[model samples]
Target chain A: EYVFESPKMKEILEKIKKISCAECPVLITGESGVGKEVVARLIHKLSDRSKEPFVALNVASIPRDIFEAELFGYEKGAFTGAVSSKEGFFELADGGTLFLDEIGELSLEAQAKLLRVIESGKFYRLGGRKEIEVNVRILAATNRNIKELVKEGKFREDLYYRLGVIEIEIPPLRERKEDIIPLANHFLKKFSRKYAKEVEGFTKSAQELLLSYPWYGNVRELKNVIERAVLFSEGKFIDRGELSCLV
Target chain B: EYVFESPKMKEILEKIKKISCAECPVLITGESGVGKEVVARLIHKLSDRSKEPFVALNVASIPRDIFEAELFGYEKGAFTGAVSSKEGFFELADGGTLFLDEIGELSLEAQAKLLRVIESGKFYRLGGRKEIEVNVRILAATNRNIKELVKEGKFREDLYYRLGVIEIEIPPLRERKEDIIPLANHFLKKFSRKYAKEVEGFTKSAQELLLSYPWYGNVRELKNVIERAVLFSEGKFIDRGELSCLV
Candidate 1:
């Protein structure tokens, strides 16, 4: 497990720890690869929703055609493909938490619909006359300037304000360089154990290069970069040649 | 002219200069108050659309009820309040550049419509059967993570890719702190000239406080702070009391 040793990380973790059990909507904002989804899971695990299903969906991954049905659920004969009534993420995660990753990609129409569902705590299934009510906590994560989107007329301002009720901005990896070495070491040890290798650590040069390079992709990118280097290492020590230049 | 002396600012300026003369759809992304609109104007004035109408519209500023009609224009009886045919932004900037500031805030339904218009090179006037074609280039600016939004499913992925052909990311003020004093001095000189005051510059402590503060609002905030300081100054130099506590 990655140890939260950096003061900034500690601060963030402490704040999160305090709010772990709270039922309020939590919005996790950060650069990509910053483990936003992981944070969401941790929150779920540590919250009252842990006993219930901790469902997660990458809104961007779902096809636009079926996005509405997927989120709000569909009834039998709602559309051509609907042979049976099916519960959506909202109904499925009832009394649990719904982690919406890359939430900024939701279409404004979808956003409005979601806002309605969130606000009313009830939604009518597609092609169904009955309205289904569910109790679910929403945890959203995104690597975007949501407020700017609210301004651009691309994102719903009311929805943004509602989702941002309890916002947490995760600092980028570069801004919290103190965690780099510790995270690298943890990954190295874990991977080494898994592979039955005797990798001790990274060479000083390799460490320096890692610190010097701008981590545009942040922790997620760093994790990928480190994994590749560790896998390719010939000996106990990871070398500078193993690390790829990010820029 | 904005003279950026910082290395980061220089890099940003170089990118701006490279894309300034092109008529291609340019997407400018940055934090709020990073002067994205200013950059848009520079691109428009420097490009082939210089002589044509350079209309700028912030989508968030437009009311939701009339947003679509405002962009696509409407004919008589288009709505209950319709009196006569009206020209939209697309029609108004038929011969020039249509600068859409904060384009990300547009509802997904609106985005789909806008994308269609931009793609077909023609759009039908509201309540009009005749297809209207306009020779206009679009310059969009936003202070948000469009890619993240694309991933979140809020913003159209295809539309984002289309608009971001020549993307320019402006560095926020804190990222390029060296520009602080220079920008402050520039603003001071300009405002002094505008206000007909003999204000020389900031006191040492005042300058230090300004530089030390983490300006979350970016350049726009800095400009406002300096402008206010200029108005309240009792002497030629700006004192610490003249500035507000940023934190």
Candidate 2:
């Protein structure tokens, strides 16, 4: 479950509720580890197509030349090593939500293909006979300033317009201090249960340190710290001493 | 040990030899997993400062907010969590070579600070009084088009000039096909020894497959594939079946 108590987060929740049912593509923007994918999943869970597949593809990890084959899939012998047919992300997420992580890192050549598929809702698999149709909703996430990328022609402006029809920007953790302790507690309990630890909560000094320190790595870093502290704790409460690795 | 026989790689080697002892900063550019760091290390090995420390700092891994404090050591109690004084990369690699990997990812603020340090050869440790001077050679690498980043105002132009005094671009593995089999054999022997396997070499089909595949991940990808094949091989020659995971 997504955890947040900040006013900024409340605004984000309100926005999610309004757009979750709509079929419009939503662009989730935030710094790395700020839970952009978490928000995208939350949106998918809240949508009418919740029971359908929610496929997540990290666009940045794919080779630029192979983006098309990876996204739209390929028939047997499509290329040299294409020994067998495979379904692509779009086909696999058919009638569901597809989350494209690190969408900003997509190459210009692939951007045009993505734009056409999004607009037309149909595409042909590589070395296939006919065009296939899919009713898939697009959700994109990026840690980069994509608009600037569009201005620089590194990203397509038309595709940006298509994907960002409803933009949901998650503020970094430092900007939402109110969410820090709550998230910390959430992770503490989660990890404590998993680790079979009797840890009750953070000590006063520990809590103060958590709130004062900037969580530049955001929720992920906080989660890691709590997991580490839980693993190292020998007492009922996690003290500042247990979190020394943070520095 | 670096392994390559392609003309592109040979040209890169020629450039490296010319600039090895020139005392000028060199920028290594190529796609991810293209062995940029290996070239950087090789340059250091061939340089006059070969005997000294060669510190490789992955600029992207450090938090933007903490970049300054990380690159320039801080005095004890510089901030809330600065429990003790420590030397930064500049001081750590003094009288040696400092390699900044993924230099394009550095924030503008950090870039300005870095530029100053490179230009003046002097910087103050965080919360320190005196200016610390270091005689350090700089080498930087990035997978992104840094020139575009500069034009977009995301990266500092001045820092780019200072770091790219002598640019050495490594072509991707696919473009340099001659290196594939050699690099594969190198990794094959290395991993075979480590894994205690008796694998001799790749079969003709496997070798052909290796040469044909577009190594989007470059040398790193080839290394991984060869390692996997070596681990899976039951006979002297690693056949096509052994590398089926590549597709």
The candidate that achieves the highest lDDT relative to the unseen native structure: 2
TM-scores of all predicted structures: 0.52, 0.51
Q: What lDDT score goes with residue A244 in model 2?
A: 69
What are the DockQ scores of the candidates, in order? 0.02, 0.01
Docking class of 2: incorrect
Predicted candidate 2 versus true structure: per-residue lDDT over A137-239, tens digit per residue:
9888899998798666567554665675456788888878789888988888889888899987878888888888888888888889788888888989988
**Residue B88 lDDT in candidate 2:** 89
Residue pairs clashing, model 2: none
Q: Which has the greatest TM-score?
A: 1
TM-score of 2: 0.51
**lDDT (tens digit, per residue) of candidate 2 on B136-220:** 8888888888888889999887777777677777787778887777777787888777567778877898867776776677766
Question: What lDDT tens digits, residue by residue, belong to model 1 across residues A82-150?
Answer: 478887888889998889888999765456567777656888776677878889888899899887887
**Winner by DockQ:** 1
Chain A TM per candidate, in order of listing: 0.90, 0.91
Q: Give the distance in Å from residue B48's predicted Cα in candidate 2 to where it truly belongs.
A: 0.8
